[PDB]
Ligand binder design. Structure first.
Ligand code: ZN
Ligand code: ZN
Length: 65
């Protein structure tokens, strides 16, 4: 909590590396990901799969959208 008032807020995508065996699709470049242990990244907040770079290209609104 806090003392005051807030308005508009934006949060980044909690993208965390994941080691799995499945065909993942990027929500930005719309392509496949070829990896071994760092198979792209997956947001543990909203739940999205994007590349390491394609991640910094997505909006900084996790949960709001
Ligand atoms: Zn997110
Ligand atoms: Zn991508």
């Amino acid at each position: 909590g806090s003392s005051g008032s807030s308005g508009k807020i934006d949060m980044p995508h909690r993208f965390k590396v994941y080691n799995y065996k499945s065909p993942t699709f990027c929500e930005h470049c719309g392509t496949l990901l070829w990896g071994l242990a760092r198979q792209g990244l997956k947001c543990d907040a909203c739940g999205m799969n994007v590349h390491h770079r394609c991640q910094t290209k997505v909006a900084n609104l996790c949960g709001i959208n």
